[model samples]
Target: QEAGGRPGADCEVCKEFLNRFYKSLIDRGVNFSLDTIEKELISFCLDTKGKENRLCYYLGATKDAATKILSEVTRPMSVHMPAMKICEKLKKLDSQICELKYEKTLDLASVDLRKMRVAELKQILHSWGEECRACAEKTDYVNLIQELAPKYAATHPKTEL
Candidate 1:
């Protein structure tokens, strides 16, 4: 049967992986309205193993959100503040690279593993890790906002996870 609004394919492994990934997001109380992005995140998770998926998802989500917020605020301000602009640009690039890595992972999943080049996969994975670190540094600013924005906290209470 078709699952999660995707094409019906008789792959128990894929189905189970998707279901678990979906549950993990729900369990973490990640109720963001970005369903398309969320689906991509789930697909990425299903294509990896161990801690890689979790790390990728965290990095992707944070980078994606940071890039979006930065794009929205920076365009109108026309502020040429060097440090802020640099950080935002880094976040945006990281997000874009992460998404590309995500798509590459999914595409690789559909290929024959026996014919896959291990070195190429490793290179992609390594680049993903580097991008993840850069994204994390940029996303740290988002955490700062949570700490500093008391009005945001007052309006949006913490949810039970």
Candidate 2:
């Protein structure tokens, strides 16, 4: 049995739901480009979380369809924005944000609070603000930044120097 009390056996509703979902995605102009299939499939999986049996059955059906499509297509075009590339970009952005935060904090801490020129502190603050804005504009980085900002701000207060 699956984690839930429901039967572990394949269910008809799950199979039909998956088929309908895939068909809907394909019919609604969901082309294979830009990792559309992977994204949609992953989204479907996520939406059905806690229903392990249903998710597995749906994925199995989708995998068979994907396999058939892969076999029939000759010289399949590569996805311009694969999931791996997206993940890598997100990782790079996260790293950059982290580095910028660290640098800004270090700069703030190294300065003497009383002696540091207001203009110099303002410049660092401005640079940090710009980095934060850029991070906010990024679709993937924004969430991480939101989660981290409170902790970061707490530890590196504006008056920390």
Candidate 3:
């Protein structure tokens, strides 16, 4: 029933990403003004990709976003509010903003591949820049990845490292 102040996993992408960017702004001593911070945020959105790109779009930070909610961000951020609190307010403006969940990381060694969706499996392969051109079934994609994991999977580095 929304008891916790913390955002659910669904808002994790925006909360975490914005927090990181905000901390960097503080570190860089960005001017504590709405217009300045808003400009910085728009510039930041220029390089976004995947789930992060969706977050930028929701915040109207992207060039193509029809609605501009950048005020909602820069207003609180100028006052030094935490990103989670800002995200909660954003959800009130558009619930779908929080619905943008980050893609789950797939651990090949210990996870069941079949339990995953075909589209998800394809995306994994796509990330690796590999594709099962002749694949007709889910297992074909699964089996292909199992065979290709050693070559492509190790390329992904640990987030902490």
Candidate 4:
């Protein structure tokens, strides 16, 4: 930053993680917009990133609003940072190396799983099996279907099942 205290040049963090994260963002290009970012913070209107945060450094920013909103939450013991909650819902829509296709994970996550009809949920599960190869590797969609088919009659939220 020299004597002026501007951002120091030639800054480098962990390239490996940065590359992976960058790839995730690029791979999930369709999901990387303010409209999408806003959804994650919608619950905490006072906690949203200032319109300028996107433009602060590189976009402009807030924390007072965050403090007010976060302090009022019905949380348990230790304080969980509201900022973390804002991002906890953000699942990077990355395609695995084995699966080149970028499936619509964001849409699946955002949709009200409980509100959808059970039959439609069946089709969704089937579609996930037929598509979203990367997500299928670890999770057994069949298992989820079997477990959730009955519970889906109600407005079920997101669950492993």
lDDT of each: 0.35, 0.36, 0.65, 0.30
Q: Pick the candidate with the highest TM-score.
A: 3
Candidate 4 ranges beyond 4 A from true positions: 1-106, 130-161
Looking at candidate 3, what is the lDDT of residue 145? 85
| Candidate 2 lDDT | 0.36
Model 4 error, position 50 (Å): 28
TM-score of 3: 0.52
lDDT of 2 by residue, 59-89 (tens): 3323334422221111121232322222233
If both were scored by TM-score, which would come out higher, candidate 2 or candidate 3? Answer: 3
**How big is the positional error of residue 42 in model 1, measured in Å on the Cα after superposition?**
6.5
lDDT of 4 by residue, 1-161 (tens): 01322221221111121223323444565343343332322332233222212111111112323322221112210122222232222223311211212221314555665566655655665644443334442235444654543322221333222
Ranking by lDDT: 3, 2, 1, 4
Candidate 1 Cα lDDT to native: 0.35
Task: RMSD for all candidates, in order, please.
Answer: 19.0, 16.7, 8.8, 17.3
Query: If scored against the real structure, what TM-score would every candidate get?
Result: 0.22, 0.24, 0.52, 0.22
Worst 10 residues of 1 by lDDT: 152-161
RMSD over all Cα atoms, model 1: 19.0
